[PDB]
Design an enzyme around this catalytic site. Structure first.
Site, PDB file in Angstrom:
ATOM      1  N   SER A   1      14.081  14.886  54.671  1.00 55.34           N
ATOM      2  CA  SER A   1      14.013  16.055  55.554  1.00 55.34           C
ATOM      3  C   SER A   1      12.689  16.771  55.307  1.00 55.34           C
ATOM      4  O   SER A   1      11.631  16.135  55.450  1.00 55.34           O
ATOM      5  CB  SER A   1      15.275  16.893  55.342  1.00 55.34           C
ATOM      6  OG  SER A   1      15.227  18.080  56.108  1.00 55.34           O
TER       7      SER A   1
ATOM      8  N   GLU B   1      21.795  12.949  62.669  1.00 53.50           N
ATOM      9  CA  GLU B   1      21.010  13.983  62.016  1.00 53.50           C
ATOM     10  C   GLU B   1      21.349  15.369  62.529  1.00 53.50           C
ATOM     11  O   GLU B   1      21.117  16.345  61.818  1.00 53.50           O
ATOM     12  CB  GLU B   1      19.514  13.726  62.210  1.00 53.50           C
ATOM     13  CG  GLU B   1      19.050  12.302  61.876  1.00 53.50           C
ATOM     14  CD  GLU B   1      18.821  12.069  60.382  1.00 53.50           C
ATOM     15  OE1 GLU B   1      19.242  12.926  59.571  1.00 53.50           O
ATOM     16  OE2 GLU B   1      18.208  11.030  60.028  1.00 53.50           O
TER      17      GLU B   1
ATOM     18  N   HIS C   1      23.011  14.280  58.223  1.00 48.36           N
ATOM     19  CA  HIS C   1      21.699  14.569  57.650  1.00 48.36           C
ATOM     20  C   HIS C   1      21.790  14.837  56.150  1.00 48.36           C
ATOM     21  O   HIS C   1      22.498  15.746  55.706  1.00 48.36           O
ATOM     22  CB  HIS C   1      21.121  15.781  58.383  1.00 48.36           C
ATOM     23  CG  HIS C   1      19.688  16.074  58.079  1.00 48.36           C
ATOM     24  ND1 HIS C   1      18.646  15.437  58.720  1.00 48.36           N
ATOM     25  CD2 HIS C   1      19.122  16.978  57.245  1.00 48.36           C
ATOM     26  CE1 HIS C   1      17.499  15.915  58.270  1.00 48.36           C
ATOM     27  NE2 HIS C   1      17.761  16.851  57.374  1.00 48.36           N
TER      28      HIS C   1
END
Ligand SMILES: C[N@@H+](Cc1ccnc(NC(=O)Nc2cccc3c2[C@@H]2CCCCN2C3=O)c1)Cc1cn(CCNC2=c3ccccc3=NC3CCCCC23)nn1
Ligand SMILES: C[N@@H+](Cc1ccnc(NC(=O)Nc2cccc3c2[C@@H]2CCCCN2C3=O)c1)Cc1cn(CCNC2=c3ccccc3=NC3CCCCC23)nn1
Ligand SMILES: *[C@@H]1O[C@H](CO)[C@@H](O)[C@H](O)[C@H]1NC(C)=O
Ligand SMILES: *[C@@H]1O[C@H](CO)[C@@H](O)[C@H](O)[C@H]1NC(C)=O
Ligand SMILES: *[C@@H]1O[C@H](CO)[C@@H](O)[C@H](O)[C@H]1NC(C)=O
Ligand SMILES: *[C@@H]1O[C@H](CO)[C@@H](O)[C@H](O)[C@H]1NC(C)=O
Ligand SMILES: *[C@@H]1O[C@H](CO)[C@@H](O)[C@H](O)[C@H]1NC(C)=O
Ligand SMILES: *[C@@H]1O[C@H](CO)[C@@H](O)[C@H](O)[C@H]1NC(C)=O
Ligand SMILES: [Cl-]
Ligand SMILES: [Cl-]
Ligand SMILES: [Cl-]
Ligand SMILES: [Cl-]
Ligand SMILES: [Cl-]
Ligand SMILES: [Cl-]
Ligand SMILES: [Cl-]
Ligand SMILES: [Cl-]
Ligand SMILES: [Cl-]
Ligand SMILES: [Cl-]
Ligand SMILES: [Cl-]
Ligand SMILES: [Cl-]
Ligand SMILES: [Cl-]
Lengths: 532, 532
Positions: free
Chosen positions: A197, A324, A437
């Site tokens: 991320s 995600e 995610h």
């Protein structure tokens, strides 16, 4: 003796931790910087002044000052991401896991946590490096960096609060590893940075930043990339945000010097309490203090660097997960719920679209709506939920990464693209959120090898495949081992654009990952927003 | 005697023609207008001056002056649409088919030929009215009207060349029928106007025009509607073309009267020769001289009339064919002649999108392109051909019609919607062209009932179903006979939006005809172009 190491900053005393049914060496909480406290707040990091004596490096350090999430108190799915140590502005430390006996110049993997540049900790249970370092016999480093306003308050021109100081933190932890990892068995010329991320975006930014290229060998990017829409701001917007923060705290706004020392007096959580009030729109997947395109760390716009080829040329291994977007809708969007199937009416869908592309005008929101609506069935609550899910992930993560993959391959020397879509059998979140995610991280870091954590034996095998792909990529620049009989993961090429699936099933090769939607997000919609 | 009828303009004497294994009466070439010749060129029609004697109404009249298709000489597939009688400005005549013995006040269907407002004839073999009149026992009329510049030169403000005089030709033939059909057994209070293509657009325009509304009862529209992009122009655009026609014939252009005076001294074929040179763009499915939004025939814009309900409220029956756009691409886009079938390269595709949407800016062209491309497979010759094929039909026929069917049903007294997707077993065209624009006409008019034309027995059954749906709708306002056990064709309503299929399979009921692509054509793209 094995745990007593003589660095260029002082001696460090580690500890012998257990792993599986063996032991390795851990060196926890080694400082690489002067504590950025006092009027060293918002300022470029300075190298740790060397120390006599023996630094006790046997316990995890503090975590940096960050907004703590209390959406679901007590719930492990969300608390697993919060700080498990005390918070303090004195938090610039790194952790080292060394196999035992200590190797001779072995491959180094440096881990950079994500958390949207406003949160994150090096000490999280799921970033425990003992399993990966032991299984693949690599030396595993995890660093830290200032987050939120403390790490990314940007008043460009001022050298009191220039911006990107949290990225400069990461650079100084890389510089320390360059100067010292050899004393732990690590090879400073075979270092692989990797993060997820905001940490994946951070990796890519070190690829582009000239002052960072010489500090690492190759790169892994998980569900992030430097060109993501939430990862950068202009010096104007970053100045707007910084000033807006002083307004929220009754600060003198006449000059920078006056603004910066006003903010240097407040207590850390005073800043954190008003952190979110500076965002220009109502948004999900947007964060207040992030890196700036300053002309220094980044010499020109990200796109003009990707175009001209102004970046480090090496091998990259990157990829994304299947869903995600889901937990970002859980937290910020109308109609979702952790204890519900989260079917969403057409009215909540058009609201989510507004929150998810917060910069678009009405023509842009119409275009996004049109692309994700099944007009034969536009009140199907499931299709509306799944549709908005895919919007968040495509816009924020997948299509930015795909755009980065296509520009990098032109000039690079090796690209390996993955799509992660195994849903862990022990997941505590509802299954409508699919592969969430951040949830490939536990497989990367070897946790399915712990019987206690109640994975399946096929998940243990998947985790072992990934640890090997990663570590082999870290050693050789290629995730496959020559002269084996396991199916090969093909190079992503400009022409064939191949990628693999990472899951428990046999490896399948696909091409052109989510190409239909990423032509919309990367080519058509920017053209339409620029022309109107 | 049956053949001798005394009208309000004179007496007429028709002929006894054979229909299958029987005979009916036919009244061919009856005049309804003074010949628009000499200084009557470009001017509103004047009622036929009543004649003494017996008008010989036993042969077809002349066809109006029009551009003749010489793309494939001798090929029946295209020559069947060309004039089959001599061409002359003296062409305003109508044909009648009356069952024998003569009914007392029966249902009247009036046919209006298409041809893009530049071509067309009442006398084509495929508009042979004898079959439908005999099989369904209705009085079948077919009118004529001036096409091309002769019918639609628009110099608004001038009363010598006003515009829409070909629509007024149609209105005077409808007025004649209103005044005289009772003498042939027709009921002037049960008149159905119906036409295909530019005829269907004409039909819709009479629904809209207040001066036409009292001249017919209900309406059938086939592959056309008034709001089609090719069916109308502004007074400005119409003026620009009228002048540019004079500029091409080295006419004086200082005033309307000298431009008009100049254009009435040119022979008809002179005008036809230069006709195509006044189009604003290189284009397909665009025609030079079309109806104009003038404020008299149409009091306001077509959209404002539909939004406000300013039109005739009655019952309509309308629909489209599967492959409306194919033959416009064959005739007008190269690439469709570089292949045995018509697999087209990606570069031919992008050019067709330019010739298919001649008014879009590059942002609009990207939007059209993006919507019809399979980016997993963008070099597929078949997908590229089929894709542009749908673009031409959806933009020009299907989605203009669906916009019209949705606006009308809010205010109307009944809507029936069809999708014609049968490929005739004896088609002379290649198979990739599918169900071509205009090839349901042969089923409407009963041609499969002739054994000599070697249709299959399943198609003769389909033509009998169609004629009945058409005629029953003409009589009662509903194409179903209740009391029947045959499958019922449901109403199209604002909520469920149902329609049926016309083919040899048993009846299927669908909903929302081509809704995904028509949301693009009818709402997103118009506002994309409004903005840029
Ligand atoms: C989007 N995040 C939330 C959020 C919170 C508060 N506020 C905003 N946003 C605002 O706008 N708040 C706001 C609040 C109050 C008032 C106003 C406003 C707005 C501000 C703008 C003007 C108008 N407003 C206001 O008046 C957004 C989502 C978010 C949360 N986590 C921390 C949790 N870690 C994670 C997970 C958690 C669960 C599942 C998977 C996870 N995997 C990862 C992987 C990467 C590490 C973190 C991580 N990470 N991401
Ligand atoms: C559109 N039609 C062609 C056309 C011819 C000439 N020219 C243009 N277009 C141009 O642009 N020509 C042009 C020519 C020369 C120079 C320039 C230009 C352009 C003008 C613009 C500026 C630049 N240019 C030039 O310099 C288009 C297509 C067309 C043709 N038929 C008559 C045939 N009947 C029909 C069919 C025929 C076959 C299959 C099914 C059919 N079903 C129907 C159903 C409705 C009745 C007619 C009909 N019907 N439709
Ligand atoms: C290092 O710290 C831990 C707790 O802070 C302590 O228990 C341990 O004994 C220390 N090791 C030393 C002083 O060598
Ligand atoms: C990477 O660079 C080396 C050295 O020029 C070259 O031999 C090799 O083929 C390159 N590999 C790729 C995948 O571009
Ligand atoms: C794993 O399963 C065992 C046996 O059912 C149970 O005792 C233990 O609490 C579980 N562990 C977790 C972390 O849920
Ligand atoms: C009407 O014209 C037809 C065709 O030429 C001819 O056969 C017929 O005799 C004419 N009728 C009269 C009454 O002259
Ligand atoms: C048509 O109009 C009649 C009489 O006003 C009305 O009773 C009937 O319900 C209408 N039908 C439809 C389908 O609108
Ligand atoms: C009609 O079909 C038959 C059988 O296929 C064929 O022999 C005959 O010649 C056809 N008639 C015409 C006029 O083509
Ligand atoms: Cl300022
Ligand atoms: Cl303080
Ligand atoms: Cl539902
Ligand atoms: Cl799912
Ligand atoms: Cl390549
Ligand atoms: Cl016959
Ligand atoms: Cl009747
Ligand atoms: Cl003029
Ligand atoms: Cl005159
Ligand atoms: Cl010429
Ligand atoms: Cl087809
Ligand atoms: Cl037959
Ligand atoms: Cl019924």
């Amino acid at each position: 003796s094995e745990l007593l190491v003589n660095t260029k900053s002082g001696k460090v005393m580690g500890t012998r931790v257990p792993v599986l049914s063996s032991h390795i060496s851990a060196f926890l909480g080694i400082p690489f910087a002067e504590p950025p406290v006092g009027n060293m707040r918002f300022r470029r990091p300075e190298p740790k002044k060397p120390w006599s004596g023996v630094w006790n490096a046997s316990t995890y350090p503090n975590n940096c000052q960050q907004y703590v999430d209390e959406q679901f108190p007590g719930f492990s799915g969300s608390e697993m991401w919060n700080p498990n140590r005390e918070m303090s502005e004195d938090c610039l430390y790194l952790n080292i896991w060394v196999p035992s006996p200590r190797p001779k110049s072995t491959t180094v993997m440096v881990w950079i946590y994500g958390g949207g540049f406003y949160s994150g900790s090096s000490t999280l249970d799921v970033y425990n490096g003992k399993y990966l370092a032991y299984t693949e016999e690599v030396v595993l480093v995890s660093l830290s960096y200032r987050v939120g306003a403390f790490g990314f308050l940007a008043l460009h021109g001022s050298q009191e609060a220039p911006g990107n100081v949290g990225l400069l933190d990461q650079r100084m932890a890389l510089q320390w590893v360059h100067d010292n990892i050899q004393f732990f068995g690590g090879d400073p010329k075979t270092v692989t940075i990797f993060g997820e991320s905001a940490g994946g975006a951070s990796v890519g930014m070190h690829i582009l930043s000239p002052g960072s290229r010489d500090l690492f060998r190759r790169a892994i990017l998980q569900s992030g990339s430097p060109n993501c829409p939430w990862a950068s701001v202009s010096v104007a917007e970053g100045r707007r945000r910084a000033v807006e923060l002083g307004r929220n705290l009754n600060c003198n706004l006449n000059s920078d010097e006056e603004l910066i020392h006003c903010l240097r007096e407040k207590k850390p959580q005073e800043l954190i309490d008003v952190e979110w009030n500076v965002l220009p729109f109502d948004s999900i997947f947007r964060f207040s203090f992030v890196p700036v395109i300053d002309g220094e760390f980044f010499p020109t716009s990200l796109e003009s660097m990707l175009n001209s080829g102004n970046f480090k040329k090496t091998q990259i291994l990157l990829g994304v997960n299947k869903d995600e977007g889901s937990f970002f809708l859980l937290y910020g969007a109308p109609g979702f719920s952790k204890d519900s199937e989260s079917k969403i009416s057409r009215e909540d869908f058009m609201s989510g679209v507004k929150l998810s592309v917060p910069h678009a005008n009405d023509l842009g929101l119409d275009a996004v709506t049109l692309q994700y609506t099944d007009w034969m069935d536009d009140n199907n609550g499931i299709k509306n939920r799944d549709g908005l899910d895919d919007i968040v992930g495509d816009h924020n993560v997948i299509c930015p990464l795909m755009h980065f993959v296509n520009k990098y391959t032109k000039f690079g020397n090796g690209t390996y693209l993955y799509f992660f879509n195994h849903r862990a059998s022990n997941l505590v979140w509802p299954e409508w959120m699919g592969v969430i995610h951040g949830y490939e991280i536990e497989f990367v870091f070897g946790l399915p090898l712990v019987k206690e954590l109640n994975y399946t034996a096929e998940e243990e095998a998947l985790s072992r495949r990934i640890m090997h792909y990663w570590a082999t990529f870290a050693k050789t620049g290629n995730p496959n081992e020559p002269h084996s009989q396991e199916s090969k993961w093909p190079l992503f090429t400009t022409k064939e654009q191949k990628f693999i699936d990472l899951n428990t099933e046999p490896m399948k090769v696909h091409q052109r990952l989510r190409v239909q939607m990423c032509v919309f997000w990367n080519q058509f919609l920017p053209k339409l927003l620029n022309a109107t």
